């Protein structure tokens, strides 16, 4: 089970998947016209995994792009590797669900769910070695957070054995734009905790902070953030795809990265996050990456290691790295951060090594963590939800949509139960 299906939806997940395909074809080497350019044999394996071989040596990326806008598919077609696409691989509907999870997955999603489900079923009939589904969308936008949630639920009801790797973009608290954004986010996650098994915390404000502190960009644009998350996805998928000392599977993460099946949220971090132009001063070593991983400035969740209590950690590396160096770094970070590292593991470690060199870098590193800090964001979004629906604010439209307040109270109770489970396991 090496093949992986990629799903793209939402107003931001489309560009996320586009950047993902761009980073993949830049990693293994491929032209936007489908012409094979990799060397020599492993690239053909990556193409059989993520692409489909058409006639005359053509390669079509196996992706299911769906959104309520023709402008989105037009824009992702105007991208560099976005031209050739099977008309059945992407199906877009009309006209808009309007930043609402309920109307997103009740009316605008229920009319196109059958078509995309038939498409994914035909793909699974054509894809024999499928293992996981990469979901790329934004939990902030109600349209995307509803469409992707409905698709994940339908895939779980159809393929319960296949893994569900969700790269949803969490809403930001600094973004004071739509009170319906965190509310749609919590309504979607109330179902995604049961429909999906692997979710990665990605906050927009975290991305803004990491591009303003490292890249020093005046205007945080979705381009570089999507590039960073696509490089992270490429690294975590080449941890198994590309040859290395130890390959990590999605099932390996499900059986090692999470202790109890209720938890599905993982905080991600990437290294090296070097400043623009300071690459000449940066020396790619193991201690610097280890120090960067355990800092709040390099995390994209974004969590503080001093606040939350580390429940489990994992660090994957690509490039020429020594096992003794990372072992010593893990021992040092366990001896110096024994308060954060919980005692019932008692020593949390999950390391994968890829011998191949990263694209454009001598060595790269990804870090996954599970702490007692996601419950803080859960409490924040729950307080926002409670204070936002005490006057029926923007809520009577939702009542006319068909949803009831009892479902909302049950969602909040389930979130509080998940928080208490994350407090067991206290902070």
């Amino acid at each position: 089970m090496r093949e992986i299906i990629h799903i793209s939806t939402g107003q931001c997940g489309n560009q996320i998947g586009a950047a993902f395909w761009e980073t993949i074809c830049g990693e293994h080497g491929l032209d936007f016209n489908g012409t094979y350019h990799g060397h020599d044999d492993i690239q053909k394996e990556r193409l059989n995994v993520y692409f489909n071989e058409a006639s005359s040596g053509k390669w079509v990326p196996r992706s299911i792009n769906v959104d309520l806008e023709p402008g989105t598919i037009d824009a992702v077609r105007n991208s560099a590797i976005g031209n050739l696409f099977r008309p059945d691989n992407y199906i877009f509907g009309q006209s808009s669900a309007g930043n609402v999870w309920a109307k997103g997955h009740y009316t605008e999603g229920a009319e196109l769910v059958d078509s995309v489900m038939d498409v994914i079923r035909r793909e699974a009939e054509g894809c024999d070695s499928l293992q996981g589904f990469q979901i790329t969308h934004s939990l902030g936008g109600g349209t995307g957070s509803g469409m992707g949630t409905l698709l994940i639920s339908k895939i779980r009801e159809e393929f319960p054995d296949r893994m569900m790797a969700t790269f949803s973009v969490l809403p930001s608290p600094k973004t004071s734009d739509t009170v319906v954004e965190p509310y749609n986010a919590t309504l979607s996650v109330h179902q995604l905790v049961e429909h999906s098994d692997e979710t990665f915390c990605i906050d927009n404000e975290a991305l803004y902070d990491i591009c303003q502190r490292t890249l020093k960009l005046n205007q945080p644009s979705y381009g570089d953030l999507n590039n960073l998350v696509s490089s992270v996805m490429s690294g975590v998928t080449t941890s198994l795809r590309y040859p290395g000392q130890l390959n990590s599977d999605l099932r390996k993460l499900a059986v090692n990265l999470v202790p109890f099946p209720r938890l599905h949220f993982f905080m991600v971090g990437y290294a090296p996050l070097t400043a623009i132009g300071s690459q000449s001063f940066r020396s790619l070593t193991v201690p610097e990456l280890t120090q960067q991983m355990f800092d709040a400035k390099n995390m994209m969740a974004a969590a503080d290691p001093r606040n939350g209590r580390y429940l489990t950690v994992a660090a994957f590396f690509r490039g020429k790295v020594s096992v003794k160096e990372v072992e010593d770094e893990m021992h040092k970070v366990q001896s110096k951060n024994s308060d954060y590292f919980v005692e019932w593991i008692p020593n949390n470690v999950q390391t994968a090594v890829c011998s191949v060199a990263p694209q454009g870098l001598d060595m790269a590193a990804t870090f996954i963590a599970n702490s007692t800090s996601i419950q803080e964001l859960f409490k924040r979004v729950g307080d926002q939800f409670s204070a936002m629906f005490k006057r029926k604010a923007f809520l009577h439209w939702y009542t006319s949509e068909g949803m009831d307040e009892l479902e909302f109270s049950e969602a909040e109770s389930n979130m509080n139960d998940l928080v208490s489970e994350y407090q067991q396991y206290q902070e």
């Binding site: 309007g98 930043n99 734009d177 009170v179 204070a387 439209w397």
Partner: protein, 440 residues
């Protein structure tokens, strides 16, 4: 479902709609004559418009689907003298044979529904020609009772006909100091009665605040009605720009409806647009959208005789057009958090409904405001309109007790109970707005 049908009722309604189609064809580079001119040219086609408002014929002619209804033959002659009548269809414009009354006592009576039936089948015939609908658009004025009467009645007729599409009614509110016609207090109270029956979204604009902006910001000595129609054409083009042009945050018209109306009944949100400055001042100032957001929160850029600083703040709509900086809007929402001037009730705080439009704003050369590449539109709910209606209710109660005009009303076909029900409805809306405000 993407198409939008606009209705022009009353003298001011046609004048507003004419400026709306004027600015529309001016943005997409279309001449007011026709064929074309030109295009359907990068990207005047898809994404629509111009195909939502400008129906494309078999030869490529983009005809604006608008219904100009008014019982005054002078207004029908004015809209026929312009070249847009050639762009319009002879069946689209409905000519008025005779004015009902002065101006609402008979416009909303059986004489009004005699012509409304002819316009209703014309709408049904227009619906059969162009399928799909996103929301009903209305343009009228409260000073003209015929415009407010025929507009409110037609609004109620289509609400009982479909009831599934949104209703955007633009109502021009007269100033509380000047009374261009003494029947206006009766019409405004009876108009609020019609909104209590059926209303999805109503936009309140005061001509006094608009004329004050032209004198101060635009440096206009005598603000004309054309400058007011052009300004309304600017604020409506920016609102519909989320459906016309492409943007990172495209906001649906129904999304504007399900992200504005909190309570079981509220129909009157306020509108504000910025920047509105002079041509020479626009060449002298080069501020970012952050200063435009700070200036849009001020009552000067509200175009209405209401103070958002005095009334309590509720979750609003913040639309942007042109080059939008994510850091600037992040700095903008950062400063308003640090402001803490308006009452931040426990329900709104994290609300400023963002609408992003990549198309730069465009202004007419007749308007004194220079064409800016960045614009901010704040559409908020404020309790100041409840105070404004209370003053209008006090004037209406004084005139109604004076029985100087009620004798003519009961002769036209009105009843004492009808005016009291409109008064009880208006008093209920003011009490409701006060109740939902005092809950902070």
């Amino acid at each position: 479902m993407r198409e939008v049908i606009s209705i022009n009722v009353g003298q001011a309604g046609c004048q507003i709609g004419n400026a709306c189609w004027e600015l529309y064809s001016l943005e997409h580079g279309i001449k007011p004559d026709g064929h074309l001119e030109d295009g359907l040219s990068k990207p005047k086609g898809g994404e629509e418009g111009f195909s939502t408002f400008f129906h494309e014929t078999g030869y490529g002619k983009f005809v604006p689907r608008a219904i100009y209804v008014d019982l005054e033959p002078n207004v029908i002659d004015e809209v026929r003298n312009g070249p847009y009548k050639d762009l319009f269809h002879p069946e689209q414009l409905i000519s008025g044979k005779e004015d009902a009354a002065n101006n609402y006592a008979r416009g909303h009576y059986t004489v009004g529904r005699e012509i409304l039936g002819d316009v209703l089948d014309r709408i049904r015939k227009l619906a059969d020609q162009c399928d799909g609908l996103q929301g009903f658009l209305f343009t009228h004025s409260l000073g003209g009772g015929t415009g407010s009467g025929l507009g409110s009645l037609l609004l109620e007729e289509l609400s009982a006909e479909y009831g599934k599409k949104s209703k955007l009614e633009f109502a021009v509110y007269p100033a509380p100091q000047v009374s261009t016609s003494v029947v206006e207090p009766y019409n405004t109270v009876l108009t609020t009665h019609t909104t209590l029956e059926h209303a999805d979204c109503t936009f309140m604009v005061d001509n006094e605040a608009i004329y004050d902006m032209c004198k101060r910001n635009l440096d206009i000595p005598r603000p004309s009605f054309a400058n007011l129609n052009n300004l309304i054409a600017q604020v409506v083009s920016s609102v519909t720009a989320s459906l016309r042009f492409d943007g990172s945050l495209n906001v649906d018209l129904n999304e504007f409806q399900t992200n504005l109306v909190p309570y079981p009944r509220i129909h009157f949100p306020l509108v504000s647009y910025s920047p509105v400055l002079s041509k020479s001042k626009a060449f002298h100032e080069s501020n970012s959208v952050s200063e435009i957001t700070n200036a849009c929160f001020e009552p000067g850029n509200q175009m209405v005789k209401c103070d958002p600083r005095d009334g309590k703040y509720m979750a609003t709509c913040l639309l942007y057009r042109g080059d939008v900086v994510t850091r600037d809007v992040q700095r903008a929402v950062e400063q308003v958090k640090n402001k803490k001037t308006v009452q931040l009730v426990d329900w709104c705080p994290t609300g400023f409904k963002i609408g992003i439009c990549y198309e730069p704003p465009t202004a007419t050369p007749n308007s004194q405001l220079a064409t800016v590449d960045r614009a901010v539109c704040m559409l908020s709910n404020t309790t100041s309109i409840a105070e404004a209606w209370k003053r209008i209710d006090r004037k209406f109660d004084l005139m109604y007790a004076k029985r100087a005009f009620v004798h003519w009303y009961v002769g036209e076909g009105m009843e004492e109970g009808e005016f009291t029900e409109a008064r009880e409805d208006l008093a209920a809306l003011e009490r409701d707005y006060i109740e939902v405000g005092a809950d902070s």
